[PDB]
Amino acid sequence: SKGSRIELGDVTPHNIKQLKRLNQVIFPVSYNDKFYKDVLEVGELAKLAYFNDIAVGAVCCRVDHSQNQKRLYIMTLGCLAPYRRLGIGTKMLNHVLNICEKDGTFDNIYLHVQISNESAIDFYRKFGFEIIETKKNYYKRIEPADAHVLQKNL
Numbered sequence: 001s002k003g004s005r006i007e008l009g010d011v012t013p014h015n016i017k018q019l020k021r022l023n024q025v026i027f028p029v030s031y032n033d034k035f036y037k038d039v040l041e042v043g044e045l046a047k048l049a050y051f052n053d054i055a056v057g058a059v060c061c062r063v064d065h066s067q068n069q070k071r072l073y074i075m076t077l078g079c080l081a082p083y084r085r086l087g088i089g090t091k092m093l094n095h096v097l098n099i100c101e102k103d104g105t106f107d108n109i110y111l112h113v114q115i116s117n118e119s120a121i122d123f124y125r126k127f128g129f130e131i132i133e134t135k136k137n138y139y140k141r142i143e144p145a146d147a148h149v150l151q152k153n154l
């Protein structure tokens with residue numbers, strides 16, 4: 001961290017419009033107004049990422065109680081294409097993993113990744129996520145429609 005050009009910051013009503021703007025560019029699906037209202041209620045489970053003080057990415061997660069487990073679902077985690085491979089993803093993912101580790105009550109953390117997304121698959125597998133399922137027809141309008149479920153056991 002010493003001398004890093006990357007910092008995470010809180011999401012607030014002042015910068016929620018910035019988060020939406022980033023999400024629009026980065027992710028191929030659009031999120032509704034309820035999504036953005038919810039982000040304001042999850043505390044440290046949502047953050048904006050800054051590179052040299054410029055907002056370039058974001059992470060939004062929620063707690064999911066399914067399969068009789070307590071799970072952390074990564075709804076969105078990403079940064080703008082020109083700033084990729086600079087460790088921003090790592091900073092965001094490590095933040096969420098540290099929240100789970102300090103809580104200690106999570107069974108697993110998981111997300112969906114479109115099957116064509118090789119760089120996301122490489123990235124999550126680096127952190128010990130495993131492809132546990134491939135969901136056919138996960139997306140309704142984009143191609144390929146299929147998504148891998150990537151899960152890390154905690």
Ligand SMILES: CC(=O)SCCNC(=O)CCNC(=O)[C@H](O)C(C)(C)COP(=O)(O)OP(=O)(O)OC[C@H]1O[C@@H](n2cnc3c(N)ncnc32)[C@H](O)[C@H]1OP(=O)(O)O
Nearest residue numbers: 078079084085086087088089090113114117119120122123
């Ligand atoms: C519709 C969907 O599928 S959404 C769910 C997936 N997320 C996205 O598609 C959002 C768009 N993508 C991104 O924002 C990025 O590509 C991310 C979040 C996946 C990775 O973020 P980055 O900031 O680029 O990752 P970071 O620089 O921390 O990468 C760390 C590690 O990941 C691995 N990695 C990351 N990107 C790549 C790549 N393109 N190719 C191979 N390995 C990669 C590397 O092993 C390793 O780092 P190093 O080899 O550079 O030391």
